[PDB]
Amino acid sequence: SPNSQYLKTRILDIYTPEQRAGIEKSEDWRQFSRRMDTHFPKLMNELDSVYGNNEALLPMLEMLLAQAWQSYSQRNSSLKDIDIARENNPDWILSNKQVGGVCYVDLFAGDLKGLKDKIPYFQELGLTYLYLMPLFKCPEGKSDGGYAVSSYRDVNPALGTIGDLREVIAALHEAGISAVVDFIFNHTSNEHEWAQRCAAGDPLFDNFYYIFPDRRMPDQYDRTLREIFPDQHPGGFSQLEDGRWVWTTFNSFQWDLNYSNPWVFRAMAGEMLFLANLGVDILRMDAVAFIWKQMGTSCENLPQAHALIRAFNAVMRIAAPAVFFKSQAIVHPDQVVQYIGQDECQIGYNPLQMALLWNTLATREVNLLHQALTYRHNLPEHTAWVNYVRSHDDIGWTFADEDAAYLGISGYDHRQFLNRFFVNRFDGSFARGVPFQYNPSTGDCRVSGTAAALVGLAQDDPHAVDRIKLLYSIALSTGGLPLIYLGDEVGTLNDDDWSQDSNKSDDSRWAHRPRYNEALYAQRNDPSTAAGQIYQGLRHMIAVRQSNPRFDGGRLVTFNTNNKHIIGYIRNNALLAFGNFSEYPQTVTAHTLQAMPFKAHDLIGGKTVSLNQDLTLQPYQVMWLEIA
Ligand SMILES: OC[C@H]1O[C@H](O[C@H]2[C@H](O)[C@@H](O)[C@@H](O[C@H]3[C@H](O)[C@@H](O)[C@@H](O[C@H]4[C@H](O)[C@@H](O)[C@@H](O[C@H]5[C@H](O)[C@@H](O)[C@@H](O[C@H]6[C@H](O)[C@@H](O)[C@@H](O[C@H]7[C@H](O)[C@@H](O)[C@@H](O)O[C@@H]7CO)O[C@@H]6CO)O[C@@H]5CO)O[C@@H]4CO)O[C@@H]3CO)O[C@@H]2CO)[C@H](O)[C@@H](O)[C@@H]1O
Ligand SMILES: OC[C@H]1O[C@H](O[C@H]2[C@H](O)[C@@H](O)[C@@H](O[C@H]3[C@H](O)[C@@H](O)[C@@H](O[C@H]4[C@H](O)[C@@H](O)[C@@H](O[C@H]5[C@H](O)[C@@H](O)[C@@H](O[C@H]6[C@H](O)[C@@H](O)[C@@H](O[C@H]7[C@H](O)[C@@H](O)[C@@H](O)O[C@@H]7CO)O[C@@H]6CO)O[C@@H]5CO)O[C@@H]4CO)O[C@@H]3CO)O[C@@H]2CO)[C@H](O)[C@@H](O)[C@@H]1O
Numbered sequence: 001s002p003n004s005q006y007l008k009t010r011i012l013d014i015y016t017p018e019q020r021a022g023i024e025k026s027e028d029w030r031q032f033s034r035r036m037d038t039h040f041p042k043l044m045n046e047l048d049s050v051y052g053n054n055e056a057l058l059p060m061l062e063m064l065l066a067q068a069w070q071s072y073s074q075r076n077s078s079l080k081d082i083d084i085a086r087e088n089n090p091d092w093i094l095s096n097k098q099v100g101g102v103c104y105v106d107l108f109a110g111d112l113k114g115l116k117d118k119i120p121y122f123q124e125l126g127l128t129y130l131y132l133m134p135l136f137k138c139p140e141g142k143s144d145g146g147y148a149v150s151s152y153r154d155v156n157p158a159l160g161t162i163g164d165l166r167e168v169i170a171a172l173h174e175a176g177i178s179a180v181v182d183f184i185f186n187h188t189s190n191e192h193e194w195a196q197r198c199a200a201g202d203p204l205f206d207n208f209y210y211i212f213p214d215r216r217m218p219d220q221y222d223r224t225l226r227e228i229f230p231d232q233h234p235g236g237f238s239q240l241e242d243g244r245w246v247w248t249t250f251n252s253f254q255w256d257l258n259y260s261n262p263w264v265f266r267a268m269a270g271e272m273l274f275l276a277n278l279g280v281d282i283l284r285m286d287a288v289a290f291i292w293k294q295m296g297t298s299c300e301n302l303p304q305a306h307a308l309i310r311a312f313n314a315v316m317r318i319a320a321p322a323v324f325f326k327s328q329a330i331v332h333p334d335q336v337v338q339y340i341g342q343d344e345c346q347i348g349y350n351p352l353q354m355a356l357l358w359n360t361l362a363t364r365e366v367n368l369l370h371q372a373l374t375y376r377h378n379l380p381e382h383t384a385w386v387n388y389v390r391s392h393d394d395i396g397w398t399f400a401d402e403d404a405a406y407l408g409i410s411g412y413d414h415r416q417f418l419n420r421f422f423v424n425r426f427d428g429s430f431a432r433g434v435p436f437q438y439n440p441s442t443g444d445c446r447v448s449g450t451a452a453a454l455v456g457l458a459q460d461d462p463h464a465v466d467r468i469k470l471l472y473s474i475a476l477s478t479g480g481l482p483l484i485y486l487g488d489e490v491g492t493l494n495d496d497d498w499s500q501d502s503n504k505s506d507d508s509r510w511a512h513r514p515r516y517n518e519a520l521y522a523q524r525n526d527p528s529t530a531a532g533q534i535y536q537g538l539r540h541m542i543a544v545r546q547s548n549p550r551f552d553g554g555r556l557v558t559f560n561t562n563n564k565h566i567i568g569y570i571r572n573n574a575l576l577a578f579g580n581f582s583e584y585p586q587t588v589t590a591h592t593l594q595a596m597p598f599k600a601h602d603l604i605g606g607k608t609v610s611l612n613q614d615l616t617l618q619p620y621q622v623m624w625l626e627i628a
C-alpha cells in the first residue's frame with residue numbers, strides 16, 4: 001500500500017515545476033497536506049479491508065485524492081473556517097444548545113425561495129439544525145418521495161435551482177442554523193445516467209449495479225434476504241424489459257449501487273465532495289445497512305458496509321472536515337450502534353427510543369423503555385444519538401427480542417398488538433394510524449400516521465396534547481440531538497387524500513406527509529387551541545433545554561421509580577426527569593425519593609416540588625426537577 005507522502009507528490013505532478021512551487025507554499029496545500037498525514041492511513045486501511053489486492057484500488061485512490069485536492073482548493077473560505085472550528089470542537093453535536101427540525105421544501109414552503117422566507121420562523125422556534133428532504137432531480141410521478149435520485153447535482157426544477165439551494169444554505173448559516181441533506185448512496189433511480197449506461201452495456205459503467213441474466217442467483221440470494229418493500233415486489237430483485245434481473249431492495253425504479261466495484265465508491269465520493277462544497281454541515285446516510293451484499297447472508301450490516309462508511313469519513317476529514325454523518329440504520333439495536341463512531345457516523349438515528357416511546361403510550365408500561373435507556377443509551381465519546389418522535393417514514397417496531405424475552409415479552413406477539421393498536425384495530429385505542437408494508441408471509445407490518453393522529457388528536461382526545469408533549473420531552477432531554485418533524489409542533493393531522501392520489505395510493509407514508517397547515521400555524525400563540533398548547537409546550541421545553549447546562553451531553557443514568565407507568569432518569573446528576581405514561585395519576589413514593597433533595601424546582605411547571613413526600617403525577621405529566 002502507498003503512503004501519504006508518496007501520494008501527495010503525485011497529486012502535485014499535475015502542475016508544472018513553476019506552478020508546483022507555488023502550490024507547495026500555499027495555505028490550502030498546507031492544510032490538505034497535514035490532514036492527509038493524519039487521516040490517509042485510515043482511508044487506505046478501510047479501502048484495503050474491502051477491496052484487498054484489487055488492481056483498480058490504487059488507480060481509483062489516486063484519482064480520488066486528486067479530486068479531493070481540487071475540491072478542497074475550490075472550497076469557499078467561510079466553509080474552511082467551519083472546517084477548522086469543528087476539527088477543534090468534535091462535540092458540537094452533543095451540546096444541549098442543538099435542536100433540529102426536518103421538512104419537505106415543497107410541502108412545507110412550496111420551493112427553495114419560499115423556504116428561505118420560513119427561516120425567521122425556524123429562529124422563532126429555536127432551531128439550530130435544519131434537515132431538508134430530497135431536493136435533487138428524480139423520476140416524475142413515482143420517485144419514492146425523492147429517494148429515487150436521477151442526479152446528485154441537479155436540483156429538482158420544481159424546487160428551484162442549484163443557485164437557490166446555495167443561497168438557502170448561506171441564509172441558514174447567517175441565521176446560525178446548520179444545513180442537513182440526504183446522501184442517498186445505496187441506490188439511484190433507474191433513470192440516473194449511470195443506471196442507463198450500465199444497462200446499455202457502456203464499458204465505462206460496467207458493474208455499477210447488480211444485474212443478472214436470469215433468476216438463478218436472485219433466487220439464491222432471496223433464500224436469505226428480508227423483504228423491505230414486499231408490496232412492490234418479492235425478494236430483492238426486479239426484472240428489466242429485456243428479461244434480465246436487477247437488485248432492487250426498495251422500489252423497482254431504485255437500483256442498488258454496486259460498491260464491490262471500487263469505481264462506484266470513487267463516483268459516490270465525488271458526489272459527496274460536491275455536496276460538501278455547497279456548505280452542507282451534515283449528510284444523512286440513507287439506508288446504510290444495505291451497501292454490501294454477500295450470498296447466504298441477509299445482506300444487511302455486513303463488515304464491508306462499515307468499512308466503506310469509515311472510508312467516506314476519512315475523505316471528509318481530508319477534504320471537508322466540517323461535514324459530519326448522520327447514520328440512518330433502522331435495524332436491530334445491536335447493529336444500530338455499530339454505525340456510530342467518531343471515525344464512522346458521528347451521529348445516528350435512535351429508532352430504539354423512538355419505537356419504545358410509542359410502545360409505552362400503548363401499553364402504559366415503561367419496562368422496555370427503561371431497559372433501553374439503562375443499557376443502550378450511552379455512546380462512545382464524540383458521538384450522539386439523533387432522538388426523534390416521528391419522521392417522513394413509517395414506524396418500525398425496533399427492539400431486541402432477546403431483551404423483551406428477559407421481561408417476559410414475546411416479540412412477535414407484542415408487535416401484533418402494537419400494530420393493531422396503532423391502526424385502531426384494538427378496543428379502546430386512541431391511535432388513528434394506517435398500515436404500511438403488511439407482509440402476509442411474515443405477519444410483519446409498520447405504521448403510518450402523524451404524531452397527532454397516533455395520540456388521538458384527530459378525534460379531539462382530551463389527552464392528545466399532553467401525550468405529544470410527553471413524547472417530545474423525552475427526545476429533548478435524554479441526551480442527544482433532538483429532531484422535530486416540522487408540523488408536529490402545532491398538531492398537524494394526516495393527509496387523508498393520499499389514498500385517492502394515483503401516485504401515492506400505494507405508499508401509506510404519504511398519510512403523514514401533509515402540507516403546511518396555515519390554519520394551525522396561525523393558532524400557535526393561542527393557548528386556547530391545541531396548536532397553541534402544543535407549540536408553547538414544546539417551545540418552552542426547547543427554551544429550557546438550550547439555556548440550562550444540566551441537559552448538556554448525551555449521557556444519562558436511569559432512576560427506578562418503582563411505578564411501572566413512570567419513566568425516570570437523571571442528567572449530569574443535576575436534572576431528574578419523570579414522565580407518566582398512564583392516563584391516570586401515578587405516584588412515586590417518598591420512600592423511593594429518600595436520596596433526593598428535600599425540595600426541587602420543576603422546570604416544566606415552574607413550581608417547587610417536595611420530594612420528602614409522595615409525588616403524584618397527573619396523567620401524562622412531565623417533570624424536570626433540578627436536584628443540583
Ligand atoms: O431509500 C429507500 C428508503 O430508505 C430510508 O428508509 C428505509 C431504511 O433505510 C431501511 O432500513 C428500511 O427499514 C425497514 C426495515 O428494513 C424493515 O425490515 C422494517 O423493520 C422493522 C420491522 O418491521 C419490525 O418487525 C422490527 O424488526 C425486529 C423483528 O421484529 C424482531 O423479530 C427481530 O428480528 C431479528 C431476529 O430476532 C433475528 O433472529 C434475525 O432473524 C433471522 C433468523 O435468525 C433466521 O433464522 C431467519 O429466519 O431470518 C431471520 C431474518 O433475517 O434477525 C432479525 C432482524 O434483525 O429484530 C428486528 C429489529 O429489532 O423492527 C424493524 C426496525 O428495526 O421496517 C423498517 C422501516 O421502519 O426501510 C426504510 C423505509 O421504510 C428512507 O428514510 C426512506 O424514506 C426510503 O424510502
Ligand atoms: O372514546 C372513543 C373510543 O371508544 C372505544 O374505546 C373504549 C373501549 O371500548 C372501552 O372498553 C374502554 O376502554 C378502556 C378500558 O375500560 C380501561 O380499563 C383502559 O384499559 C386498560 C386495561 O383494562 C388494562 O388491562 C391495561 O391494558 C394494557 C396492558 O396493561 C398492557 O400490558 C398492554 O397489554 C398488551 C401486551 O403488552 C401485548 O404484549 C399483548 O399481550 C399478548 C402477549 O403478547 C401474548 O404473548 C399473549 O400473552 O397474549 C397477550 C394478550 O393479552 O396484548 C396486550 C393487550 O391485549 O396493553 C394493554 C392495553 O393498553 O391498560 C388499559 C389502558 O389503561 O382503557 C381503555 C381505553 O380508554 O373505554 C374506551 C374509551 O371510551 C374505541 O375502541 C376507541 O377506538 C375509541 O377511540
Ligand SMILES: OC[C@H]1O[C@@H](O[C@H]2[C@H](O)[C@@H](O)[C@@H](O[C@H]3[C@H](O)[C@@H](O)[C@@H](O[C@H]4[C@H](O)[C@@H](O)[C@@H](O)O[C@@H]4CO)O[C@@H]3CO)O[C@@H]2CO)[C@H](O)[C@@H](O)[C@@H]1O
Pocket residue numbers: 557558559560561562570591592593594595596
Ligand atoms: O456506577 C454508578 C453508581 O450508581 C449508584 O447509584 C445510581 C443507581 O444505579 C441508579 O439506579 C439511581 O439510583 C436511584 C434508584 O434508581 C431509585 O430507585 C432510588 O433508590 C431507592 C430504592 O428504590 C429503594 O428501594 C430504597 O433503597 O431507597 C433508595 C433511595 O436511597 O434512588 C436512587 C438514588 O438516586 O441513581 C444512582 C445515582 O444517580 C450505585 O449505587 C453505585 O453502586 C454505582 O457504582
